[PDB]
Design a protein around this ligand. Structure first.
Ligand SMILES: COC(=O)C[C@@H]1N=C(c2cccc3[nH]ccc23)c2cc(OC)ccc2-n2c(C)nnc21
Length: 108
């Protein structure tokens, strides 16, 4: 359960201001209506975002660090799945995932 404590620090890091230039699209769930996407939920069956991870973090919904990392990676996979690789939101996702993978790897 000490490793869940480190996951909270990783989540705080992703939500911090130093990464805001490429983390802001993942703060909240994809609002398909507001963005004009007519097919997002037919392609993405399990939406995920940083605020959902924070909510499940606070409600003790992650049994271990690997369940936490599975949700963070699901959020990036949804982005890679829905968007073409040339798209800009994908480039932001890769930067933020590179931050996450670095912090998750440095975990005891
Ligand atoms: C217009 O929406 C899209 O084409 C997809 C969308 N792009 C983006 C997006 C994010 C940043 C630069 C962008 N340029 C074109 C699309 C795009 C997006 C924007 C948001 O604003 C609150 C929230 C979520 C996303 N997002 C995520 C996450 N995964 N795909 C997207």
């Amino acid at each position: 359960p000490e490793q869940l404590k480190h996951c909270n620090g990783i989540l705080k890091e992703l939500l911090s201001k130093k990464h805001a230039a490429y983390a802001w699209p993942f703060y909240k769930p994809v609002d398909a209506s507001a963005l004009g996407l007519h097919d997002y939920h037919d392609i993405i069956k399990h939406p995920m975002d940083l605020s959902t991870v924070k909510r499940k973090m606070e409600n003790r919904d992650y049994r271990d660090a690997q369940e936490f990392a599975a949700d963070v990676r699901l959020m990036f996979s949804n982005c890679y799945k829905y968007n073409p690789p040339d798209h800009d939101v994908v480039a932001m996702a890769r930067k933020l995932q590179d931050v996450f993978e670095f912090r998750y790897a440095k975990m005891p």
